[PDB]
Ligand binder design. Structure first.
Ligand code: 9PG
Ligand code: 9PG
Ligand code: 9PG
Ligand code: 9PG
Lengths: 479, 479, 479, 479
């Protein structure tokens, strides 16, 4: 639309927008597409990925992006559009970095936007109908905090302290094994005992399998008989070809313009498919999973692979928001942890939000991060990189950096590496682990109990430097 | 739209169009697209190039068009569309030639139209919204003459006689050098002393450089103190990546739909870019250049590379014509010579129009003409060929065939070749040279003054046969 | 050459070869190429990899072989030929498996031979000039055992018990650290303390680095002062572009026919190159390294990346065997452990031979095994698989299955997985670990010493069933 | 073959050769292929083209060569092999440049060699049978002068002073026109009046055409009636499809292994073909051209396009030498100027040798040099670049830099540009022009007569700096 001139952060900025208003910290723009030109040579672009596991990092806009491999896995890495592109696109918000350490930020205030970054331009484009934008120029942390104020919030007190079954036993869980672990776990200051992936018969068959013979409502009662809330994991909108639901209700599968199932990724050794979050029947079967778990005794729910409800990217965020809005009301005031979730379109609905890739018992699988050009794989470095670039969302949701390791048995991480993750859990307030206590040395049990029981003050000094208690922790070598 | 039958030129012509009425010399059609069927086996297509340097010739529609190389130079050679297509498209007007030397001519009367030629069809397509057409069948000269009278005019008496700095010193000009030449030239019957490319600091920095220390107003006053008008050259809408304005106003660059600068070609050893001529702030800045030049004392302006204001082709003619309209008037009654310009969309705005490629001190550069298949390169043969096929515009504008050579020093043209170009200058009456008189032999100093200072009577007897004075110049060998 | 008929193993076998005579357990053939036709529908091909880390398994010859990725790593994975071909080729020996669990085995008795497998043919081709073959049909174990007895032996009593620095500290080793560990390790029933990769300044600069200030003779004397022999690791024929010797002696680099250095793969983040092992000046410089190490006080040498001396595959085995022959003897009666080595061309020269990929503190890296289709990467599953299919070499060399893990700290293996690897160490009798005892729990310190210090009796009952002590270890699930 | 160590120029040098002897200035090597490794990081490679027009220049061995276009023209640019290659090959001699301004030179002493240049290697490879090499390390000018001493010589006094018809009239010559020019030319101190291309009926029809009605023996008599030797131009081994000879003797055409004519280039608007210099009939018909011209009165012969006798490159040099050996004896002690000739294989037979591309009346046709990546096209810069890098041959033949311009009429060159060429004619002693005296201004006539009549002392200071008389001329900006 119209060419406009503006004074922002003591700089002259030129832009193209259909309308412009004032706003706290910067300005409000309107238009299906807006173009914002930096008053400097731009050295960095803030490339914000789409969902939890997606790369969030400052990148060189000059050099070209590297294709992520294998193609089967892109639907579970990012917005399919941001990866097929030969240019640098991001989801929702972008930012260019001036030579003085300040950032020109362009951020959507409605669903379904993307931002393009070149060294001379920030271009915002709504996939569907137009919408509002926020534009700001200033120090890096102020412009991101100013942007966060203008998005939905949902801050439910302080985030609980969770013991999570995933990052030790993975899918090899079982009612007998978790009963024993529950006994040792209840001696520590946790608030929630969360069962992760491994209890269900199949994706879409969310009923206990052979290794949970007394069902899920039994387990949750023993968990609360120990003064602990019971948490359960679902991938509500995910399905495989082998799932009974996929053949019993073929009209529930999300299909493209030719009726082929939309590809949703590759995991558990199998191609993944999505249930159609636009189908009101499906959204109800999904909300019914929430209430079936609440009836079972669980008041903490880990809703995973949530990008499947928003495929194929920006274009699907409006369906996604409608569908998670219904699950949100079905859950009442149960805790909802969004995982693999479209990050910005979850604000206001989620209670905690995973903001990076899976931690893992290792720093980096170089085969996946480097040879396959996939920074969304499990790994402590991949986890930390994106989480550091999403902490500005602590204003809007409990930010989940993922679990913290204290064990050295059955873990390749170094003690220095482990303290980097521990320090972000302090900073966000989100404290979880998957460490079985019988895997902890006595020295390590004590670190875990001190970690849960004390609120350690922590301060941000710069983008990668923190003061945790009185230690100074620096993350800048990581990148 | 509708199918129609017609008696045109005593033959029966089938045509498809939305409307039809009578017109001096043929008929007017209406329609975004129109189709005309020749009542003969068409043996030639008149392929009319977009801009001054584009090819304008009769072509064999049977044989395919050769790609022009290198690809980077295509935007400065023609409408990009006419060079990507695998068929014969023309800009504005096309014609089919019968076995009796008569032409079936279809020509747009509004901006933004191309014409396709096969031996069995003339198709006319407006890029933008629809418009009117002129269809006519008769002798070659009358149908083109008839077409001309329905297009805008601006015939401002007789064209001035110009001494031009380009075709001798190229960019290696300076204040002291041109003062020395001004002294020599002022002894001949010139009316304009015009400083060409070479005085400016950079494209988009239209202020004098280190070799014009006393500035450009000084130089105009020195020129007027000899009874001459002062001419100046601009390329207003052209810009390079190293130009200061490309960095200081990146929002003025003409960008495609993903924010990339659209390429305007390759000259002065660098890639070329365009300022956006639909950006009203750009048009007034360009209009200001005209005012600054008038204020400096110049009342003859060579505006060059004007295609850059009409990229990406027929689709840009609307934005172009308006931007040139604002220039046409900041100029008042100054003389505007249009160079590298969309030919038909300039009519009624220019006083003078280049209609062929640059002349050069040589007949043809076979490496660019043949091996790179680029007939828009500098060369006397290239220049004559497009000029001869656009003489029919002489009642709409001063038709500039480019400068005439009289020197044999620092020139590879033969005498026979030089007198072809002289002849066309007599015919159009646009008389210009670049020869420094100190480079001239006493013989040649005489022919130069003989040429400038009496009006030789000149007659067209064929498409490529001419009687100038009494000389029967025949241009049929060259094509 | 000639067509032949034969009674082998009570079945009638057609074969083509230049010569034939009797042999213990089958027949000897002669010929540069020989062809053998199975008297059955062959349901499996034994694909024998070239070097220690190459794949050695039974494969379905019907289904095509998957390309190994990335291409840069192919020279360190196998004979380059076996990875470029679209058929199933093996190194030295192949076998076809009948429906009755019996094998038709063809195996070269000289250097430089490959064996091709289809379900209808065993073809054996010498790369260089011709040689002799062993053909045999019978039970799987006896034909491989029979093949073994015709190849060179060097069985030097019992294999020493080694503490190895690699699978705990990797390259981050130093004098002070290994002194601390030497103290802890010297309390267990080890015989060799072996310093692995990490002491050297660079590949081809085999002098101590900044972290071994007192040098390597010092460290050997400290090791012997505890009643241990001192081991040292070299990669003698490997070199990187930044290695000083790559610059100071460019004539020692192994070059192709146009003078380009032949690539040896990609490790330590850099491209790998080879020193030319047909360059006698190189072989003596490499022989000098052995002498220098003996002079320093080391009498156990792990010679690694030995494939670099045999590039580009079967064609290099002649140059390799001679270069290893000169090393075998500068070593005198020192113990030579061959790693990354051409398996069959090492026999009679090595005292010990790695026969599988590296073990790792994890079962499998699915990104390298599956998605990059590289079974030569580090991993316990990869290690067991090639080791089980080369146990038949135990009467020719000490068969090293790689180190055994007892720690659970800094290790992702399960206990069940660890005892698979322990079992194979008992079976071969090659006992080694890398666990720093300070990393061990009191339980694990006990099993380590139990493991080192009494000889457990061990029996093979199947190809993948074993009785170690009394445990009936079954390896059939993993393949 | 054998690895050898050597002390050369006070440096240790390593090489691979079959034999080594001592030799003045360096050493003599033997072998079909030799490899020489620099004792420094190499910054430049001396890439020596094959024939007169071929590029001779120092190049960056690190960056890749650019394909020369169009493919039709490669046979007349260089050895077809040096252009098809993805590496840097040269004809006959190569050299690597140390950081101190010294050169390691490897040069063939027999026919049909090429030299490869990498930053770490100089590789010599004889196409046919093996041969001798010269190897030297030292200052750049000494090693090239040392190499030249070991090649054939033929120094016939001082080179004549020639007036040549080519670089003014080109093919548009004629007996009447040249008679007039002969009259003005004889007033100056020339020794030879040479008729160039344009007198013959066709390639292979070496008889006077319509514009020489009194034949060639007439013209040569009038030339000597003015005290001047008469010189004539031939392309003896060249033919086009249109030539009477090409159809009358199809068995004379040089054909490949399928009987197709070998492509020899593209000139005079037509594809070029070669007569087979291996065919003894052809070599005689060619020697007969020499004697037919001597019978006519001409004692100076310009034998052009001589690469056709040596196609397809190094492999054809032995035929070429045999065939020019016969023409050399047929010519007796007539002067033979070799043009378009294989440079090193002509030594000993030619009297003067063109060592670079055609001069032209312009500095550079950027369309051919840059867009078509063809530095062998006509042009003063292209001429100078190769000639400067071949002056070391003044020891072995009269080195022809090509004609010198003095006119400014019908010439685009600048006076500064013209003096660069004039200075190389002084330096070599080879003085020629094509300037018709009636095209010279009086000032310019006087420069020409002073140029012919005085021997100006000239001195080489460095690779690109000369002292001509007392002026210092610097060529280094050129490259
Ligand atoms: O690289 N991937 O495609 C990929 C990333 C993460 C992942 O784990 C998610 O699912 C797990 C349960 O299956 C855990 O709940 C975990 O906490 C989740 O974040 C699975 C696959
Ligand atoms: O790309 N080409 O084919 C091409 C480049 C430059 C050119 O010259 C135009 O700009 C010149 C100033 O630079 C002169 O004013 C000249 O009179 C103009 O016509 C013509 C053609
Ligand atoms: O490319 N690979 O698949 C690969 C790289 C290294 C490696 O380790 C070998 O070298 C190591 C030292 O760097 C250890 O000594 C180890 O014991 C050796 O076997 C094995 C395989
Ligand atoms: O770029 N080419 O392919 C090309 C180079 C030189 C050339 O000229 C040679 O032939 C001329 C006569 O035809 C003159 O004798 C001249 O002196 C010769 O050097 C012709 C073509």
């Amino acid at each position: 639309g119209s060419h406009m001139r503006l004074n922002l952060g003591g700089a002259e900025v030129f832009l193209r927008a259909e309308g412009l208003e004032e706003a706290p910290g910067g300005v409000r723009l309107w238009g299906r597409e807006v173009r914002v030109f930096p008053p400097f040579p731009a050295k960095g672009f803030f490339r914000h990925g789409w969902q939890s596991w997606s790369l969030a990092a400052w990148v060189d806009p000059a050099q070209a992006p590297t294709p992520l491999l294998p193609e089967a896995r892109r639907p579970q890495a990012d917005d399919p559009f941001l990866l097929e592109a030969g240019a640098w696109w991001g989801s929702g918000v972008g930012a260019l970095r001036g030579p003085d350490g300040r950032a020109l930020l362009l951020g959507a205030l409605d669903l379904g936007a993307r931002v393009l970054g070149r060294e001379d331009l920030l271009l915002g484009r709504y996939a569907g109908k137009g919408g509002a934008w926020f534009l700001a120029y200033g120090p890096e942390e102020e412009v991101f905090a100013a942007y966060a104020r203008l998005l939905p919030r949902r801050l439910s007190g302080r985030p609980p302290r969770v013991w999570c079954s995933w990052y030790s036993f993975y899918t090899r869980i079982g009612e007998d094994l978790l009963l024993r672990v529950l006994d040792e776990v209840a001696a520590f200051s946790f608030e929630v005992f969360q069962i992760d992936d491994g209890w269900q018969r199949a994706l879409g068959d969310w009923e206990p399998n052979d290794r949970f013979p007394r069902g899920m409502a039994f387990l949750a009662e023993r968990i609360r008989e120990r003064g602990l809330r019971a948490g359960l994991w679902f991938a509500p909108f995910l399905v495989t070809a082998d799932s009974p639901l996929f053949q019993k209700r073929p009209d529930w599968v999300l299909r493209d313009g030719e009726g082929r199932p939309v590809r949703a990724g590759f995991n558990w050794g199998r191609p993944l498919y999505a249930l159609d979050a636009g189908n009101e029947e499906v959204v109800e079967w999904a909300a019914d999973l929430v209430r079936k778990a609440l009836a079972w005794g669980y008041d903490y729910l880990k809703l995973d692979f949530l990008y499947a409800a928003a495929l194929p990217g920006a274009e699907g965020e409006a369906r996604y928001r409608k569908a998670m809005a219904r699950l949100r009301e079905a859950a009442g005031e149960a805790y909802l942890l969004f995982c693999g979730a479209p990050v910005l379109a979850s604000l206001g609905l989620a209670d905690g939000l995973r903001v990076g890739p899976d931690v893992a018992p290792y720093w980096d699988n170089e085969e996946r991060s480097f040879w396959l050009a996939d920074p969304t794989g499990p790994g402590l470095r991949n986890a930390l990189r994106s989480t550091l670039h999403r902490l500005w969302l602590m204003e809007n949701v409990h930010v989940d950096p993922d679990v913290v390791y204290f064990r050295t048995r059955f873990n390749l991480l170094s003690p220095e590496e482990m303290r980097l993750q521990e320090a972000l859990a302090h900073f966000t307030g989100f404290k979880a682990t998957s460490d079985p206590p019988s895997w902890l040395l006595p020295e390590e049990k004590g670190r875990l109990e001190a970690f849960l029981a004390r609120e350690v003050p922590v301060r941000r000094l710069g983008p990668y430097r923190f003061r945790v208690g009185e230690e100074e922790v620096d993350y800048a070598p990581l990148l």
